[PDB]
Amino acid sequence: KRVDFCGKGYHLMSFPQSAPHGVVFLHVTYVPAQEKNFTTAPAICHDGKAHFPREGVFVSNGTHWFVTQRNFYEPQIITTDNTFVSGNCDVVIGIVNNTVYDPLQPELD
Amino acid sequence: AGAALQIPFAMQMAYRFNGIGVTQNVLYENQKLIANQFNSAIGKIQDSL
Numbered sequence: 001k002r003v004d005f006c007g008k009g010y011h012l013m014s015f016p017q018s019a020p021h022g023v024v025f026l027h028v029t030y031v032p033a034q035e036k037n038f039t040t041a042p043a044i045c046h047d048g049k050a051h052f053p054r055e056g057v058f059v060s061n062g063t064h065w066f067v068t069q070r071n072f073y074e075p076q077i078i079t080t081d082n083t084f085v086s087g088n089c090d091v092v093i094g095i096v097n098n099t100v101y102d103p104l105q106p107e108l109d
Numbered sequence: 110a111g112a113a114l115q116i117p118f119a120m121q122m123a124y125r126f127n128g129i130g131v132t133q134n135v136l137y138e139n140q141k142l143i144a145n146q147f148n149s150a151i152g153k154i155q156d157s158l
């Protein structure tokens with residue numbers, strides 16, 4: 001878990017090899033690439049309540065909002081099970097109005 | 110570990126709190142106190158040196 005102790009980047013595996021008077025290490029490393037731009041937001045206001053992500057980050061391609069993990073990009077529809085609420089949003093800075101989908105209300109119909 | 114990627118400072122600070130076990134909910138409601146404490150501490154250390 002320590003950064004750059006063995007290999008440059010995130011570390012996956014290593015293989016040892018012998019030498020006449022030494023050792024040789026083959027490190028396997030994971031490197032992200034081909035990034036993009038996105039517009040973020042700290043938290044979502046909805047019906048007077050503030051929602052934060054559980055493990056991820058809110059992004060918006062320009063019209064709609066999604067929650068994605070930090071190191072990879074796969075947008076998912078915002079729900080009430082992958083986010084958590086804590087208090088009303090009147091002191092948080094950067095809030096944006098939007099709606100939060102839930103499965104239970106459409107399910108009960 | 111690669112090319113630099115921009116990020117607002119507040120979200121990076123939230124990640125840093127989330128790393129140590131304190132949830133990110135705490136930081137976002139106490140930004141001013143943290144900023145004031147940080148500034149006072151850095152001024153104090155400058156004066157001490």
Ligand SMILES: *[C@@H]1O[C@H](CO)[C@@H](O[C@@H]2O[C@H](CO)[C@@H](O)[C@H](O)[C@H]2NC(C)=O)[C@H](O)[C@H]1NC(C)=O
Pocket residue numbers: 061062063064
């Ligand atoms: C941002 O992403 C949303 C979600 O995919 C896009 O909205 C959809 O766009 C497609 C066209 O590619 C439509 O068929 C869908 O009906 C749209 N809505 C949904 C809910 O999927 C939106 O177009 C994207 N914004 C930009 C600028 O590309």
Ligand SMILES: *[C@@H]1O[C@H](CO)[C@@H](O[C@@H]2O[C@H](CO)[C@@H](O)[C@H](O)[C@H]2NC(C)=O)[C@H](O)[C@H]1NC(C)=O
Pocket residue numbers: 093094
């Ligand atoms: C990010 O920085 C910009 C630059 O100042 C902020 O834009 C200002 O927003 C306020 C209110 O939203 C306006 O009164 C100012 O006129 C804006 N500044 C400019 C230069 O247009 C923006 O609010 C900042 N974002 C956050 C979340 O704080």
Ligand SMILES: *[C@@H]1O[C@H](CO)[C@@H](O[C@@H]2O[C@H](CO)[C@@H](O)[C@H](O)[C@H]2NC(C)=O)[C@H](O)[C@H]1NC(C)=O
Pocket residue numbers: 095096097
């Ligand atoms: C998000 O929604 C809130 C609540 O509807 C908006 O707050 C209202 O804003 C208008 C215009 O500024 C005021 O006249 C009202 O008094 C505000 N409160 C209410 C209860 O309506 C807010 O403007 C919306 N947008 C943002 C960016 O927060």
Ligand SMILES: *[C@@H]1O[C@H](CO)[C@@H](O[C@@H]2O[C@H](CO)[C@@H](O)[C@H](O)[C@H]2NC(C)=O)[C@H](O)[C@H]1NC(C)=O
Pocket residue numbers: 142145146
């Ligand atoms: C947590 O500690 C901070 C700082 O130790 C407190 O903030 C100070 O509160 C006193 C009490 O009135 C003020 O005189 C100072 O100006 C405050 N400092 C700053 C930087 O704002 C805070 O009140 C404490 N909170 C709790 C719940 O104990």
